[PDB]
Amino acid sequence: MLLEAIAIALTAAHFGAPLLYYWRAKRWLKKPWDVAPDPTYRPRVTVIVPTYNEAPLIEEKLDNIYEQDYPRDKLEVVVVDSASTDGTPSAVRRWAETHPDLALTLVEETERRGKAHALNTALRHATGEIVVITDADALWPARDTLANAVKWLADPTVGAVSCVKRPRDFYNVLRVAESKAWATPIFHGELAAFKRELLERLGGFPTDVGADDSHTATKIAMMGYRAITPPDVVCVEAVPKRGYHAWRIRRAQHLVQHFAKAIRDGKAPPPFKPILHAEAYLHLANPWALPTAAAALAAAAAAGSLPAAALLATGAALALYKPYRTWTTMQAYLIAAAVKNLWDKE
């Protein structure tokens, strides 16, 4: 009956860890920000939209950037497209001449070499103090979204700002709590704002990691700057429609590469090290504890004891309730990401 022991031990560990971490997040959450947004801070801003074959959405994406209240003499746009088959370059060119007061630079590249490479080239042609990366399928809900993020970058210790997303609460809590404590290791591509000096020390975006926003936020936090996601900087998450599950596992893959590579570079500031280690644990270790328990009880069930069959029937019965479904499928995504990662490289 020792596989029931190991099963309920592993289940207690797997579900115990995130809830203790959530409780420590909620005590950080009730401590006030040690940095302040400044509404008169007005630096030069470069918004970069990297695009590969997104001719449908990029006209309306440009219209969405165009409609920000942010003052236009301090705003410029670089649409970086590295050899798209669709007519995206002269779609942006067409729009570019329909909206002339908005400074636009379409830089085009020999050859597609991935998102980070495109971003790196766009960086050298950018003139702003703040660089905002945003995905072409991302739309900013308000006309002061951009200004809200910028207001949060005024403090010299804040190196990077990203948004809180809406369409779980637990996920958001971890974000803003880690932000208040020091930094959050997960940023969002819907809006990722960096100080150009910092990108330029790092320097630029490196090709090796999938989650460029989160990896850059994490290395800026490693340097002693704040990487934060304030609750009033909110974007809408762009859900893909096709291949929802493949899309979510590929995001999980980016997160697992990022956390695996991040923990292997020691020396985190004392405020960050518990955040970094907890998030890396939840992303690299805890998922495995789940299906190991499930297999322990499956073997215990098919042969022998079958209180284990009651435990798996209760597991399915708890798939009734939708937060359990969300959590278990996120763990599933993470496990698939780990194996897809290991066999992807060869």
Ligand X SMILES: Nc1nc2c(ncn2[C@@H]2O[C@H](COP(=O)(O)OP(=O)(O)O)[C@@H](O)[C@H]2O)c(=O)[nH]1
Site residues (CB under 6 A) for ligand X? 50-52, 54, 80-82, 112, 114-115, 118, 135-137, 240, 247, 251
Rounded to 5 degrees, φ, ψ at 46 are -110, 120
Nearer to Mn ion by C-beta: 137 or 279?
137
Tokens for 129? Answer: 């103090």
- What does the alpha-carbon distance between residue 140 and residue 235 come to, in Å, rounded to a whole number? 6
Span near Mn ion by CB under 5 A; candidates 134-142, 146-154, 201-209, 216-224: 134-142
Q: Which residues contact 148 (CB under 8 A, 6 or more apart)?
A: 37, 142, 230, 232, 233
Span near Mn ion by CB under 5 A; candidates 22-30, 117-125, 132-140, 209-217: 132-140
What, of ligand X, Mn ion, none, does residue 281 touch, CB below 5 to 8 Å by kind? none
Nearer to ligand X by C-beta: 26 or 125?
125
According to the binding rule CB under 5 A, does residue 137 interact with Mn ion?
yes
Tell me how far, at minimum, the Cβ of 187 lies from ligand X, in Å: 13
Tell me how far, at minimum, the Cβ of 87 lies from ligand X, in Å: 14
CB 153 within 8 A of CB 196: no
Nearer to Mn ion by C-beta: 44 or 251?
251
Span near Mn ion by CB under 5 A; candidates 87-95, 137-145, 264-272, 326-334: 137-145
What, of Mn ion, ligand X, none, does residue 258 touch, CB below 5 to 8 Å by kind? none
Cα distance from N-terminal residue to C-terminal residue, the chain: 39
Centre a 10 Å sphere on the Cβ of residue 115 and count the other Cβ atoms it contains: 20
Tell me how far, at minimum, the Cβ of 149 lies from ligand X, in Å: 18
Nearer to ligand X by C-beta: 7 or 79?
79
Nearer to ligand X by C-beta: 139 or 174?
139
Q: What is the 3-state secondary structure (H, E, C) of the chain?
A: CHHHHHHHHHHHHHHHHHHHHHHHHHHHHCCCCCCCCCCCCCCCEEEEEEECCCHHHHHHHHHHHHCCCCCHHHEEEEEEECCCCCCHHHHHHHHHCCCCCCEEEEEECCCCCCHHHHHHHHHHCCCCCEEEECCCCCCCCCCCHHHHHHHHCCCCCEEEEECEEECCHHHHHHHHHHHHHCCCCCCCCCCEEEEHHHHHHHCCCCCCCCCHHHHHHHHHHHCCCEEECCCCCEEECCCCCCCHHHHHHHHHHHHHHHHHHHHCCCCCCCCHHHHHHHHHHHHHCHHHHHHHHHHHHHHHHHCCCCCHHHHHHHHHHHHCCHHHHHHHHHHHHHHHHHHHHHHHCC
Tell me how far, at minimum, the Cβ of 81 lies from Mn ion, in Å: 16
What, of Mn ion, ligand X, none, does residue 337 touch, CB below 5 to 8 Å by kind? none
Nearer to Mn ion by C-beta: 195 or 248?
248
Q: How many residues bind Mn ion (CB under 5 A)?
A: 1
Tell me how far, at minimum, the Cβ of 226 lies from Mn ion, in Å: 27
Nearer to Mn ion by C-beta: 76 or 137?
137
What, of ligand X, Mn ion, none, does residue 64 touch, CB below 5 to 8 Å by kind? none
What, of ligand X, Mn ion, none, does residue 178 touch, CB below 5 to 8 Å by kind? none
Tell me how far, at minimum, the Cβ of 295 lies from ligand X, in Å: 31
According to the binding rule CB under 5 A, does residue 54 interact with Mn ion?
no
Tell me how far, at minimum, the Cβ of 303 lies from Mn ion, in Å: 46
Side-chain half-sphere CA neighbours of 284 within 13 A: 19
Tell me how far, at minimum, the Cβ of 53 lies from Mn ion, in Å: 12
According to the binding rule CB under 5 A, does residue 76 interact with Mn ion?
no
What, of Mn ion, ligand X, none, does residue 82 touch, CB below 5 to 8 Å by kind? ligand X
Nearer to ligand X by C-beta: 54 or 178?
54
What residues line the site for Mn ion (CB under 5 A)?
Answer: 137
